[PDB]
Amino acid sequence: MKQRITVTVDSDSYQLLKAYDVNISGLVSTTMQNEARRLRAERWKVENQEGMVEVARFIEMNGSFADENKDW
Amino acid sequence: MKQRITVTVDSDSYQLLKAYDVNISGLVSTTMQNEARRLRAERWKVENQEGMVEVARFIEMNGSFADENKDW
């Protein structure tokens, strides 16, 4: 009558969720409901957008001095 | 040291995912990861959604600097 699905995490991200809101076990099956609905002659196709979000540069124009300097 | 997260489904949606692609156990900890990262508490913290573009220009500079010209 019941199925025990157990993802022995402690290392995986599961713990992250419960670490801040141990109310996901039910979510587990919830995430499947959305996928459940979704699963119907379709998967993703349209979802990935941009992909780039702040790559953190390291230049910001080095040629900038305001205290009598120009090292090298 | 492992943590056994057991969402005894059979009734919950878990089964739908495993009944059609029993490859979620890992997913459980993964789906929560994306949420784990995304964990930013509401949509109010610092600044808003970035990446606003009216067009699609790709000319931030000329190439290096303005120290030569001879448009031929």
Question: Residue A24 is part of a domain; what is its CATH number?
Answer: 1.10.1220.80
Cβ-contact B24, B14 below 8 angstroms? yes
Closest residue of B to A11, CA-based?
B2
Which CA distances in Å does B67 have to B15, B49, B62, B64?
Answer: 66, 37, 11, 9
- Decide if B42 contacts A51 (C-beta within 8 A): no
Interface check for B22 against chain A (CB to CB < 8 A): the answer is no
Q: What is the CA radius of gyration of chain B?
A: 25
CA distance A70 to chain B (A): 18
Quote the tokens at residue A66.
């305001």
* Number of structural domains chain B divides into: 1
Contacts of B4 in chain A (CB under 8 A): 6, 8-9
Q: How far apart are CA B14 and CA B57, in angstroms?
A: 45
Instruction: Record the tokens describing residue B6, joined without a space.
Output: 């057991």
Q: Are B10 and A1 in contact (CB under 8 A)?
A: yes
- The SS3 call for residue B18 is helix
Q: How far apart are CA A56 and CA B9, in angstroms?
A: 43
Which among A34, A57, A12, A29 is positioned nearest to B32, based on CA atoms? Answer: A12
Q: Is the dihedral of CA B58, A47, B42, B25 positive or negative?
A: negative
- Cα gap B18→A67, rounded to integer Å: 65
Q: Which of A10, A32, A35 sits opposite B2 (nearest CB)?
A: A10
Euclidean distance between CA atoms A15 and B24, whole angstroms: 15
- Using the beta-carbon criterion (under 8 Å), do A5 and B3 form an inter-chain contact? no
| Token pair 């409901």 in the structure block, residue | A33
Range of the domain at B71: 1-72
Contact list, B7 vs chain A (CB under 8 Å): 5-6, 25-26, 28-29
DSSP strands (E only) in chain A: 4-8
